Amino acid sequence: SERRRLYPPSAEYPDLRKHNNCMASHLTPAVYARLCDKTTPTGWTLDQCIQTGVDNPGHPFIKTVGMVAGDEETYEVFADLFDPVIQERHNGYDPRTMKHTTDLDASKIRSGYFDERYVLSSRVRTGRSIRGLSLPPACTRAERREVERVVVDALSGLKGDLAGRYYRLSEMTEAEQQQLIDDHFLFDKPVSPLLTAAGMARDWPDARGIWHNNEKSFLIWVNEQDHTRVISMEKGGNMKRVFERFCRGLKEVERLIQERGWEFMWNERLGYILTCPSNLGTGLRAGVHIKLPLLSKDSRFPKILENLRLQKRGTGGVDTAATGGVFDISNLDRLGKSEVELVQLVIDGVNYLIDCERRLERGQDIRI
Amino acid sequence: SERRRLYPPSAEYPDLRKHNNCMASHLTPAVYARLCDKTTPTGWTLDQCIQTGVDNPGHPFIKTVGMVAGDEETYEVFADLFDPVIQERHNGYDPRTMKHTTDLDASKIRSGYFDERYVLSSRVRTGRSIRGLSLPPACTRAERREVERVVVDALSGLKGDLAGRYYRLSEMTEAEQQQLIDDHFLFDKPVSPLLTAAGMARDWPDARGIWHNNEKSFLIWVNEQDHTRVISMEKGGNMKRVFERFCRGLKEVERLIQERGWEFMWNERLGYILTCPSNLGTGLRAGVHIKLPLLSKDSRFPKILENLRLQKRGTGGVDTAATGGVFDISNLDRLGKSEVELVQLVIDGVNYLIDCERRLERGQDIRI
Amino acid sequence: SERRRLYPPSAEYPDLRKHNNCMASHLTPAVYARLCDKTTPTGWTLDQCIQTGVDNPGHPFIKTVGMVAGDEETYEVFADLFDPVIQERHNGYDPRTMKHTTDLDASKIRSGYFDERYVLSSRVRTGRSIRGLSLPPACTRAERREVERVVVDALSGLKGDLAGRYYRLSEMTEAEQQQLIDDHFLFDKPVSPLLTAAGMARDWPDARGIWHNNEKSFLIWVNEQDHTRVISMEKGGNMKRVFERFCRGLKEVERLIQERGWEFMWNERLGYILTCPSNLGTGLRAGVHIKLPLLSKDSRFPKILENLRLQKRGTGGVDTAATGGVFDISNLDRLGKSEVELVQLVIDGVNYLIDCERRLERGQDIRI
Amino acid sequence: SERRRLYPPSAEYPDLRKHNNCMASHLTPAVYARLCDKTTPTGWTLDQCIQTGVDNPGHPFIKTVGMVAGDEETYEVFADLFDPVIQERHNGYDPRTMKHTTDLDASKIRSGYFDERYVLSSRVRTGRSIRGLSLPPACTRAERREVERVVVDALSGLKGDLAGRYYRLSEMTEAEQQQLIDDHFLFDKPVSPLLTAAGMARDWPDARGIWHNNEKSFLIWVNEQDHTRVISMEKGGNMKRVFERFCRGLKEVERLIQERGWEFMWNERLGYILTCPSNLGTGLRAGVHIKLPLLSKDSRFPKILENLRLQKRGTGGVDTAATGGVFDISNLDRLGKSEVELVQLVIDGVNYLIDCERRLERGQDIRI
Amino acid sequence: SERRRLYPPSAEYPDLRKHNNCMASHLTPAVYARLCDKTTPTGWTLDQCIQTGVDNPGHPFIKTVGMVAGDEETYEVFADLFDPVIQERHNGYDPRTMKHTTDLDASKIRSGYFDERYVLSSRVRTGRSIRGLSLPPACTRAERREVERVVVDALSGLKGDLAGRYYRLSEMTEAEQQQLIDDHFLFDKPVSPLLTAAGMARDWPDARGIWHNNEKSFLIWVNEQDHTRVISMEKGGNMKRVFERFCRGLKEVERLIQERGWEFMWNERLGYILTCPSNLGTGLRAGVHIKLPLLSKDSRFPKILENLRLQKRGTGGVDTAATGGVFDISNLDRLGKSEVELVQLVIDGVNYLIDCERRLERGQDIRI
Ligand SMILES: Nc1ncnc2c1ncn2[C@@H]1O[C@H](COP(=O)(O)OP(=O)(O)O)[C@@H](O)[C@H]1O
Ligand SMILES: Nc1ncnc2c1ncn2[C@@H]1O[C@H](COP(=O)(O)OP(=O)(O)O)[C@@H](O)[C@H]1O
Ligand SMILES: Nc1ncnc2c1ncn2[C@@H]1O[C@H](COP(=O)(O)OP(=O)(O)O)[C@@H](O)[C@H]1O
Ligand SMILES: Nc1ncnc2c1ncn2[C@@H]1O[C@H](COP(=O)(O)OP(=O)(O)O)[C@@H](O)[C@H]1O
Ligand SMILES: Nc1ncnc2c1ncn2[C@@H]1O[C@H](COP(=O)(O)OP(=O)(O)O)[C@@H](O)[C@H]1O
Ligand SMILES: CN(CC(=O)O)C(=N)N
Ligand SMILES: CN(CC(=O)O)C(=N)N
Ligand SMILES: CN(CC(=O)O)C(=N)N
Ligand SMILES: CN(CC(=O)O)C(=N)N
Ligand SMILES: CN(CC(=O)O)C(=N)N
Ligand SMILES: [Mg+2]
Ligand SMILES: [Mg+2]
Ligand SMILES: [Mg+2]
Ligand SMILES: [Mg+2]
Ligand SMILES: [Mg+2]
């Protein structure tokens, strides 16, 4: 009957009195009550958006957004809660007013070569979603298989240096997968509670895979945390070559994908849409590992790092710590700046860090 | 259940990598995704609109639109795809901004007499659709029979020189139909793939017919490719008389049709609505055949023809080629210009063509 | 408004006064009125079922059903019209009461070797539809591509003698396709009016292909007239080996298809569901070509052939005639009998025909 | 099914080629097609509005509107057709633009006494509808009974000179009803085709009645052609007393009706809503009979009458003619002018008419 | 539009080619296709039912069902898949035909005392669900809080020896929770993949708690894996006292719950409804730990255990192994047998096990 009463929204309000994530900070009873009825056309709802944040109050060793998007419409349907979170996460970028600009030019990134005694590794990463298909948090098996087929068919057209092969996770022996993971190429099974709570580990390892070139300098993860994750890696400090290869490969992949009538998720307000609001905009993360004996001498590291808008993850894996200090240092903000700008910022920050080692003298300049 | 997922629009996107029609040129994944859910009140959909273009990439010896309209609402519902196609097809006429004006006056078409040694035939054609009834691509049997009844009842009222008789295709012996076709009067069965793919050959020959006057100088095809096709023909170069008869007969037919409460499809933005976007506006085609020994001497013909906005089809039938060169030359653009203007343009172009007989001198002037 | 009146069903009733197909014979105003509102869950309707029959009254040189099915549900939704047609087409088999049994055993088909001087070719064909996907008359582009992907992935698992390769029609040069067609391997473009009117030529050649083994003795047409057409052919009279290979290959293909969670359309009442009601049940056609000088001496062929329940097509296919008499003789009925029974019947009929070479004496026995 | 086609609106368009009513004049195929889907909340439709006009092309001896309203919403829902009709019927009043003002003051109508030798009868009539109840063309039995109950209960409260009694038509002997009709008090059974075609004779004589005061100078017809018709009569030429009594009685009746929570249909754009668009606005008709020997001498009567905006009906009954000339002369326009203005206009026109007795002189002044 | 096509069910079919759980064994494409549209009134669907089984193919050291129920209606809506699974899991009990009988009598369980040198612990467990509230896999925050409130209010009425207190998990320090877990009283956080994949760890630790008596011999877990889990423990081999206390406490709890108008989920076909089909029927598990030096001598243990219908989990925790062999031995089947019968079976099995200590002789009797 229509006379039956629903549970009032405040009855469903999560208990976030001990949470320490941006979703908990920016969620209020008014917002929850306002948004608890809405839903994206594919059925995504607010509770599904904030489940990962609700279940995970902590997760060292970095601050977490606590939200995910089930599809493109989410960021528009639940903008009343995503917008403040995005603004806080990206040092003040305002999606409501500002616009995002993307440029991928390896010409305007001159220099960008690091000392081989302090870097010994350079990687550039980005993510891409296929329009019309639900994101990993909400995708069904059919949608995941469709994403895999589209990506594999597109990548089959890559020729020349970028030519490579696709390896299905379900067809790889555990030893091979472990060897690939230990080499920083493949992705590990999603056991971290943040991924599991978001629902981005359903049906594992179905429809997940890795497409890599023969030199393994150009890789593409299929269906791990986004529809596609494009990676360009090199064991050294030559960020210039890595970024040039990344740019050309990404352009070719986009062209091949569009050839078949598929287009990436994108809007000028937010840039490239991805699951985690922390990856919006360019979704780009350019970083380098650090030599063990050197940066270990730092004492006021976090202040300097927040000074330069850089983030320091441990060795391979965000969930891992740093032992025998070798830190993966990358840019912190991915929205509001162009890819070239982000790479230049990373290069400048790393040059500062290696210059700030000061193994002969003492003194931290910070230099806000 | 509502949790089941539909095929993403890009999955249905046609493969037009080898097509050479305006629909293929102006169709993009964004447009297809935007329009793949809409539908006219009678159920016409985008796929039905573009089926003929998808199936037919070629079709010599002229460029083809590759689209058809199922009803009046189509041009409004799918305007996002029809408008660029119409603009390209009609040398820049912009339906969004401009307006179309129609005038049928035989007084302001002074002159217009061709040399009898180079024309020997003059025809004028137009199309008309009855409002409220689906177009041939989408019409059911009941709608087709209704169109036939309305047209026949209206035409029964014609008196005087225009007085004529209606002949039902289903009641005509094959020999009589073949004789009429060979005389350029009747229409042949629609075997060309463009007509069949559009669905404009369903239930043949049911409800199709030809109404012609005793002299056979005035004819009306019922349910061939439009609801009505009004034709005025004469074996000679006297375009003036042909056009005068065409104008008066068309006015009388329109009056008789409106007498019973039926009105033609029409809107000032597009003019007279017809199935093929190439026939919008006036839908008028005025043309003449050409004497065999004469125009055969031409070498740079296509450049001159595109110069004058004229189209050259072979002998009887667009699908046929030209042998022993005798070309059917007509106007190319039917929207944005009035009927009088189009006829005057055809007369000027034909006078230019005959003036360039070059049986005693050489040189092509083009004269853009 | 709800006060508006629909066209009465009799207004839409087709004009079949001159038709000569089973649909025209068994269609009555009462049946049409009863069924003109129903529709299968995918939207198939009666008019779409009978369009091919309505448009085509003739089509030599064989009697035609005049109907097609858009999906599995059709045969159940429109049973009131399909059942009499099926019963008449399959010499009295009653789908309402009887049941169909299928057995594919090459052991119980002993003998089956024809004289090499009168056969010189032996082929066995069947069709199969993937459950859950619309049939070629109604399938959209996405469904056709899904069928192609499922079939190709399944067939990739065939090993040993059956090992083969898939060739996409869109990627084959016209010369190669013509050579394959002339060799009786590949299928030609569907230009015959029966196929076009049924809508089984939309989006050609998208998603159509041929998968064949290295010896080309085992072929599979993908998306030509059914979802799959499995063919086993040999240039000779050894029907035994051909049928054995056909049986084992079909079993392997079915196993591979089921491995991935796809099941063939099938119900014990009708057997294997296919587009044309003439292919229901087993859908099997076993046949042989005939030597030119020999059977040409016959005069009362049609009576004998109808006596033996055999069909006589042209050497080039159903749509071609027989010149320099070389007739493709096959079984006529495919529903109500098992595959082994049909093959044995074909063998017995061919042995009877060759026994009646009438080179020594004369006289036709008929032998009903 | 949704694929079935409705009859196109032009198929339902009435055949008005021989009609002579305002509805026929102002009805066009475009208007009919536009309005043939709409309907008032109570279910009234355009065909029901125009049925009376369609069935009746003639009806001497006056020009007829040819339309009726089923409820209050009609004039708003079908304004596209009622507005031109109202404008033509009320000599230019434009309901879209201008507003209507009502005043009932017997003080500002000084004079207004006619010669007893040329009038011998004075009547004033008006109509009123109860809001929330369907009009007589569309009212069901329950609604008609509700109207009767509301009106009778209200009128029971009248006191003093206006005190009277209610007589139910179903409880009155035929002789009494005939006597009342012959005295110009009661209304006759609705046998005229205009009333019957409009559906305003259904369930006769159920729920119809007459409430009159003891002197029979104040009367109220219940459910004859409107919900209420208030009438004030006097056998003489004293229009002043008749009109003041009419005003006070109408005010008292309105007060009593509003006492119980019922309000009259009214909007400033149109005034008081009634069934026939010819009665909109005030709905007031003030008139007088004429002595037999006197006005019979007129020859150019119609021109003069149209000059003064007066209408001449025969003796008792609009449907009746004038024998032994005694004409009922009243105002022609009821909308756009106030009641006092209309009464003054009638008085001036009657004074003009009697002044033109022409028993001793000659001249048709007309005096536009 | 309604012309868009859904993904065929076989496209969503899980890839279970390597799974080893009952759901994978008893899931077929036909069943999946049949059930993929249905849904319980609260929105539970088949994919949600089988997600835990799909994600987890293994999970030593016991065979897993691989399914869960979202609410009471699930077992009825998806019976076509639950029934075979239940039958296989409960050694042939047929829910379709048979009925379940429950009796909780401590009188008819005479004896039941184990040797203190081989048991040193005795526990009895059961589960209960509140009717009208979604099960832990599907319950929202409001429903979980409602379950907690109902259970706590009911348990507040327990008096006498059963008198106890409720401890909210969110209000207990980590040290206290760890101490309780190490003592085998409290439940640990659900980190095992089977619980997480089923969605039974959402919003942890909100609304989860433990209500225990002062002696801690009677405990009730609130919202861990069922709505309520009632447990009775004793550090010894006196199963008689444990079971009688369990019976009386359960009866009192049920009475108190029903006092407020709440009733347990129950139907005679299945008994007491719970999330995991392995806990249906009584949901009872009676077990004992085993002394370290003793049962370690066994070699053919699994055959004997399957002989006696007993299951051997490791030490505290099903997910944990057995080191220094001390096995938790309990009954294996909970549906089709009464609680008294199950406890007697457990007692007989444990007596057999201890009798087969073989510390003096050798030989395994099995004794099927
Ligand atoms: N600079 C680098 N050099 C080598 N490997 C890297 C680098 N940065 C990241 N990786 C590899 O990427 C994998 C996942 O790292 P993660 O923190 O998830 O980066 P992302 O943000 O791109 O997911 C790790 O296994 C790690 O080895
Ligand atoms: N100038 C002409 N003289 C004689 N016949 C003509 C002429 N133009 C067209 N026709 C006749 O019209 C028929 C169809 O021509 P088509 O190219 O379809 O013209 P339309 O554009 O009006 O369809 C042909 O059979 C042809 O004989
Ligand atoms: N027994 C046979 N031997 C050789 N070729 C054959 C045989 N049967 C069919 N074909 C070839 O297959 C092609 C299509 O045959 P068709 O008449 O469509 O058979 P079906 O009815 O099974 O489709 C033709 O080109 C024909 O040459
Ligand atoms: N001036 C008048 N004097 C007497 N009776 C009248 C007068 N005007 C109208 N009536 C009476 O009203 C009755 C109906 O007349 P009708 O033309 O319908 O007027 P209305 O416009 O009020 O309907 C007739 O029977 C007639 O006798
Ligand atoms: N016989 C027993 N004696 C002592 N503790 C037990 C016994 N059985 C179970 N437990 C305790 O119950 C907790 C959970 O046990 P579990 O294996 O989940 O039982 P269930 O299969 O009923 O969930 C463990 O921490 C364990 O210490
Ligand atoms: C660890 N996280 C959370 C974040 O991005 O803040 C991922 N989105 N992977
Ligand atoms: C041949 N065509 C295509 C076109 O007009 O371009 C017809 N519409 N008939
Ligand atoms: C030629 N036909 C018609 C028939 O089978 O009768 C095909 N279905 N191919
Ligand atoms: C006679 N008529 C028609 C009209 O008013 O024009 C009535 N409405 N009574
Ligand atoms: C470990 N399991 C699976 C099972 O019961 O089989 C739980 N339901 N807890
Ligand atoms: Mg990462
Ligand atoms: Mg043409
Ligand atoms: Mg064939
Ligand atoms: Mg009247
Ligand atoms: Mg447990």
- For the CA of A60, the nearest ligand: 6
- When CB atoms are compared, the residue of C42, C132, C142 closest to E10 is C132
Chains C and D form CB pairs within 8 A to the count of: 32
Q: Does D8 touch chain B (CB under 8 A)?
A: yes
Cβ-Cβ contacts under 8 Å, E45 against chain B: 1, 3
DSSP alpha helices (H): ranges in chain A?
9-12, 22-26, 29-35, 46-55, 74-77, 79-89, 141-155, 174-182, 193-197, 239-259, 292-295, 301-308, 339-355
User: Which residue in B231, B244, B233 sits closest to B128, CA to CA?
Assistant: B231
Beta bridge partners of B66: none
Distance CA A167, CA C150 (A): 20
Contact B118, B359 (CB under 8 A): no
Residue E8 DSSP class: P
Distance CA D273, CA D267 (A): 8
Distance CA E334, CA E279 (A): 6
Distance CA A62, CA A318 (A): 8
Distance CA A310, CA A308 (A): 5
Termini Cα distance of chain B: 64
Tokens of D163: 């005190």
Q: Is C65 in the pocket of ligand 8 (CB under 6 A)?
A: yes
Tokens of C123: 């082929």
**Would you call B339 helix, strand, or coil by DSSP?**
helix
Residue E290 DSSP class: -
Distance CA E101, CA A114 (A): 76
Nearest ligand 10 atom to alpha carbon E64? 6
Contact C289, C295 (CB under 8 A): no
Q: What is the resolution of this structure in A?
A: 2.4
Annotate E158-197 with three-state secondary structure: CCHHHCEEEEEHHHCCHHHHHHHHHCCCCCCCCCCHHHHH
Residue A37 DSSP class: S
Quote the ligand 2 centre to B328 CA distance (angstroms): 8
Query: Would the CB atoms of B261 and D32 count as touching at under 8 Å?
Result: yes
Q: What's the longest Cα–Cα distance across chain A?
A: 80
Q: Does B192 touch chain C (CB under 8 A)?
A: no
Residue A109 DSSP class: G
Pick the residue of B1, B10, B12 with the most C CBs within 10 A to test the interface with C by mutation. Answer: B12
**Would you call B353 helix, strand, or coil by DSSP?**
helix
Contact E302, E128 (CB under 8 A): no
Nearest ligand 8 atom to alpha carbon C276? 8
CB proximity list for C92: less than 8 A, separation 6 or greater: none
Beta bridge partners of A229: A127, A221
Concatenate the DSSP letters of all residues of A226-242 into one string. Answer: SSEEEEEEESSSBHHHH
User: Which residue in C224, C216, C124 sits closest to C165, CA to CA?
Assistant: C216
Query: Would the CB atoms of A14 and E206 count as touching at under 8 Å?
Result: yes
Q: Is B125 in the pocket of ligand 2 (CB under 6 A)?
A: yes
Q: Which amino acid is at A280?
A: L
User: Inter-axis angle of helices A141-155 and A239-259, to 10 degrees?
Assistant: 110
- According to DSSP, the β-strands at A164-168 and A122-128 are unpaired
Q: Is E86 in the pocket of ligand 10 (CB under 6 A)?
A: no
**Rg, chain E, Cα only:** 21
- Cα of C294 vs its chain's centroid, Å: 28
Tokens of C177: 């396709």
Tokens of B190: 């629609």
Tokens of D264: 């009259």
Beta bridge partners of D234: D122
Kindly report whether the peptide bond that precedes residue D205 is cis, defined as omega within 30 degrees of 0. yes
User: Inter-axis angle of helices E239-259 and E339-355, to 10 degrees?
Assistant: 160
Quote the ligand 12 centre to B220 CA distance (angstroms): 13
- If you search the block for the tokens 């009140």, which residue do you land on? B41
Q: A94-99, long-range: CB within 8 Å, 24+ apart, which pairs? A: A95/A269, A95/A270, A98/A336, A99/A268, A99/A269
Tokens of B103: 């005038």
Distance CA B262, CA B272 (A): 15
User: Which residue in D91, D111, D123, D119 sits closest to D344, CA to CA?
Assistant: D111
CA distances from A146 to A14, B6, B345 (A): 35, 12, 55
Termini Cα distance of chain A: 63
Distance CA E303, CA E310 (A): 10
Contact A68, A276 (CB under 8 A): yes
Query: Would the CB atoms of E203 and A47 count as touching at under 8 Å?
Result: no
- For the CA of C221, the nearest ligand: 3
Based on the number of CB atoms within 10 Å of its own CB, is E362 exposed (0-12), middle (13-18) or buried (19 or more)?
exposed
Tokens of A105: 């030019």
User: Inter-axis angle of helices D239-259 and D339-355, to 10 degrees?
Assistant: 160
Report yes or no on chains E and A touching (3+ CB pairs under 8 A).
Answer: yes
Distance CA D358, CA D353 (A): 10
Query: Would the CB atoms of E33 and C132 count as touching at under 8 Å?
Result: yes
Q: Does C5 touch chain D (CB under 8 A)?
A: yes
Q: How was this model experimentally determined? A: cryo-EM
Output phi, psi for B367, to 5 deg.
Answer: 60, 65
Beta bridge partners of B130: B264
Instruction: Please tell me whether B313 is known to bind a ligand.
Output: yes
Distance CA D37, CA D142 (A): 27
- If you search the block for the tokens 């000659």, which residue do you land on? D362
Query: Would the CB atoms of E202 and A197 count as touching at under 8 Å?
Result: yes
* Residue C340 backbone class (left: φ over 0; alpha: ψ -120 to 50; beta: rest): alpha
Contact C288, C114 (CB under 8 A): yes
Q: Is D276 in the pocket of ligand 9 (CB under 6 A)?
A: yes
Quote the ligand 9 centre to D63 CA distance (angstroms): 9
Q: Does C351 touch chain E (CB under 8 A)?
A: no
Contact B231, B253 (CB under 8 A): no
Distance CA E262, CA E148 (A): 13
Q: Is D51 in the pocket of ligand 9 (CB under 6 A)?
A: no
Cβ-Cβ contacts under 8 Å, B142 against chain D: 5
Distance CA B366, CA B358 (A): 13
Query: Would the CB atoms of D7 and C3 count as touching at under 8 Å?
Result: no
Instruction: Please tell me whether C68 is known to bind a ligand.
Output: no
- When CB atoms are compared, the residue of C7, C54, C141 closest to B14 is C141
User: Which residue in D230, D255, D228 sits closest to D157, CA to CA?
Assistant: D255
User: From the CB of residue D344, how many other CB atoms can be counted at a distance below 10 Å?
Assistant: 20
- Cα of C309 vs its chain's centroid, Å: 16
Q: Is E157 in the pocket of ligand 5 (CB under 6 A)?
A: no
CA distances from A165 to A177, A209, A247 (A): 15, 11, 19
Closest approach of chain E CAs to the CA of A264, in angstroms?
Answer: 21
Distance CA E295, CA D155 (A): 105
Cβ-Cβ contacts under 8 Å, B51 against chain C: 202
Query: Would the CB atoms of B36 and E6 count as touching at under 8 Å?
Result: no
Cβ-Cβ contacts under 8 Å, B36 against chain E: 1, 4
Those chains having 3 or more beta-carbon pairs within 8 angstroms of chain D are B, C
Contact D103, D338 (CB under 8 A): yes
Residue ranges of B 34-63 with Cβ closer than 8 A to chain E: 36-39, 45, 47
Contact D183, D142 (CB under 8 A): no
Distance CA C92, CA C86 (A): 8
Strands (E), chain C: 122-128, 164-168, 209-213, 218-222, 228-234, 266-267, 271-272, 285-288, 310-313, 328-331
